[PDB]
Write a protein that binds this DNA or RNA. Structure first.
Lengths: 57, 82
RNA sequence: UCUGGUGACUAUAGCAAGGAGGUCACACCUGUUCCCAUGCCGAACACAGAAGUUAAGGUCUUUAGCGACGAUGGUAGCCAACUUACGUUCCGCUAGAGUAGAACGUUGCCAGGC
RNA sequence: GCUUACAAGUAGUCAGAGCCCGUUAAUGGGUGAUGGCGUGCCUUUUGUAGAAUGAACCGGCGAGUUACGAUUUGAUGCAAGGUUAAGCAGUAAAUGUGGAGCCGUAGCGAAAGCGAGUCUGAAUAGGGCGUUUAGUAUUUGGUCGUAGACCCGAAACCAG
RNA sequence: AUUAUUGGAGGUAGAGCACUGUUUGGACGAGGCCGAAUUCAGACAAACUCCGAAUGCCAAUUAAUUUAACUUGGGAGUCAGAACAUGGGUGAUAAGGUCCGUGUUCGAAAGGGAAACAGCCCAGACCACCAGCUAAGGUCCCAAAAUAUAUGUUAAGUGGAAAAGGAUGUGGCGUUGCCACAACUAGAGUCGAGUGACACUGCGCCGAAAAUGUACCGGGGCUAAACAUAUUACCGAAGCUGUGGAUUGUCCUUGGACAAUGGUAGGAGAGCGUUCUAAGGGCGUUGAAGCAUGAUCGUAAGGACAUGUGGAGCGCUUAG
RNA sequence: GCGGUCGCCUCCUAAAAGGUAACGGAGGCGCUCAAAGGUUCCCUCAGAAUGGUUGGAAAUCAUUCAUAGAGUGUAAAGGCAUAAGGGAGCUUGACUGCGAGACCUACAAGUCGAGCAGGGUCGAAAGACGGACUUAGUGAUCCGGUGGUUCCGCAUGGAAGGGCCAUCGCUCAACGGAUAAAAGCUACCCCGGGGAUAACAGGCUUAUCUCCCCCAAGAGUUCACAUCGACGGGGAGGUU
């Protein structure tokens, strides 16, 4: 019911589509974390922009 | 270096921008265009009309609906609902 | 509830064979005397009448052989992804056509003699 | 004064012994045995260490300006109004006086014309531009127009 | 703007032979020695479709996150692009070739790795520090960190550069069969212990010739300091964290903040100094301006103050 | 340079929305039609063989297999048995003034439209018609000429003349049209520029070129492997 994504990669060198999704979650710079509620529209957002962040809890 | 035997080609014409112009399920105005094509790919259904052998337009306000007619032929419609 | 009549379904609704009944009602059946009329012959287009009949059509019941709908298990292709130099290969998602086993000889709409 | 004859260098910069100094007094100054890192500057280019262009060195001089208009922005004065020109008596005083004029307060139409409406024309009907009104005078900044108009440079043409 | 659930438009990859065109053949009709069209199986298609994805596109007036968006005006610059990876045309499935389409980087981007290498991999520099943790790539010496552990594979220095082929190379995968097969011989009998085609392989071998000098491991050198896996430890950037400070735009409505701060053509804002004028107040033979030197002050353009030389003018504050 | 092209329409390339380049691969247009136009009826395709002076395998109307493989005035695609294909009568809507809204688009252009007034043709009527199944069949402005021409016609009124409204004629095909009056040579050439663009040399590439192999067909009466070398295939070199 509570997740905390963490940017562990750079957003430089990828397409704009993923760049927008990364900023849509709330992540700003690298090595940054944001705690949010687990929803069906949140799981699909991290699935699109995968292999760049780290989900846990 | 040598004057070639030229090309018996090179001609074409300006494209006309055919296709759909209003999306299924969105609200319209009386008199707006819905589709532009040669011959009747999509027939006119309910409260729509064909212009000069093209331009299927709307006749009253409402929301558009794309639908099948018989077995293999489609049609467009507008419903008064608001 | 049977047939006749209107309005929905992707031929699942079919062409290919037949089976069997009645004229309440669709049919085959009499000619130009009239309404209309084939640049062409009242078979289509019309009329008054039906003594004669059920072949066919019409309806059900049979053939899955005749053709579409074709649920799974795969597989080609493809969107990301890490590799390598790709006519590839691995890793994650969505996975077809065709091929089967099948469903398969329409669900009804609302009325008329019952 | 300090340093140099086994050494490969866009010559600096970061660290660092030794030998001399003594200031605008502060975690001061001069010299440099060794170590790491490092292919000048301007222009023109998809790209220049470039074997593409320019400059021997030093000093002095050497390129968006002014007049009159147009439009927009800031500032101030008065406000359905705002303001003067050429003049004339004055420290070449630029403050008085000077109401020809200019903008705005009402538009629409090719015009006659009518007017909060008007043209359209067979149509008051449907439409177009208007109506709900804030502007104006001087100055400041930005850009533009007519003048050479940011600066330097031609082969050539005509007149005496 | 992105995502989750839903609706719709379309005909590409791929398939397919149901139309159109083109094919290979077996039984197929079409003269007096060998034929038109057809028939059961099949094959091909940028201008052939009974079919038909993934992705993208338009709406959703549907929730969760996030921070844009549109309209009018002032001022612009740009109209020679390049490589890499994919999807095609053209040429010779030639070119660091040429023309379009979808992305990223360079252009206008420093820092780390690829020995050196605008476009390849990792990552976006506001400033101070002799602090810490990581990314790609790496850990015998040059040169920061394992001469680490366990397991296999490889005898060429393969690693550390090409192909059709060729073969008594091989570690793994299945056979097949004599209880003979190495010395028997037809172009018949024994003794004692492994033999081979074939099939998929993984790593090798030969095929492999160029002009200044070893001469593509970067060099010394290595039988593991090579290759394929597993798990670990540590090293590694101007990335992130720790500590102090500068500016903003916010915010709250006095300093803690919240975020943010590569940059070419361009747009916007705040300043420093030079010559002259006006007003006020000043300095100067007890030495002005200029010139020379210095270890000083401000976030930059800059500003003071002593000391020497010089011998008559020159600062400061506010505005033009 | 020579040659060929220059405007408009259809398809493929174009990667399932739209848009998308090359001296990339194919065809067309500069009209025609009083009917091939409007309205109300009525009808129906090919590839198929029958045995019919005659047969030209095919000149005939039938009949049935006939699934659009036919026919559309004109090229090509998208469409159509509502037939949008084939005939028949009647007629002129191939009408006047307008049009909410929308597609396309730098601009000028270009495209479709319910309906609103008026007058009508067709049909018993409901209704249908603002030119041909759909997309090509032209070209601004200026000037000049014509007719009707509720407007200004200047000292007053007439009044040539202008203006609104409706027509007409060039030719601008280099087809958004420099002034609708436009040919060559410079080996004497001159100035401003560029490796944005050729000749010589370097670099990339290897069609051709020179070698090396692979299969071996053929040449030797034997011996395809003494030697020669058919087509075809795989490489190296950078000296044409």
């Amino acid at each position: 019911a509570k997740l905390q994504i963490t940017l562990t990669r750079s957003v430089i060198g990828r397409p704009e589509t993923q760049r927008k999704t990364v900023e849509a979650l709330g992540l700003k710079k690298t090595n940054s974390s944001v705690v949010v509620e687990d929803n069906p529209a949140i799981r699909g957002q991290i699935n699109k922009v995968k292999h760049l962040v780290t989900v846990e809890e | 270096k040598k004057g070639v035997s030229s090309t018996k080609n090179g001609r074409d014409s300006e494209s006309k921008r055919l296709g759909a112009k209003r999306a299924d399920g969105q609200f319209v105005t009386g008199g707006s265009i819905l589709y532009r094509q040669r011959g009747t790919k999509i027939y006119p259904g309910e409260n729509v009309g064909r212009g000069g052998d093209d331009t299927l337009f709307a006749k009253i306000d409402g929301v558009v609906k794309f639908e099948r007619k018989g077995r293999d032929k489609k049609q467009v419609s507008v419903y008064a609902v608001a």
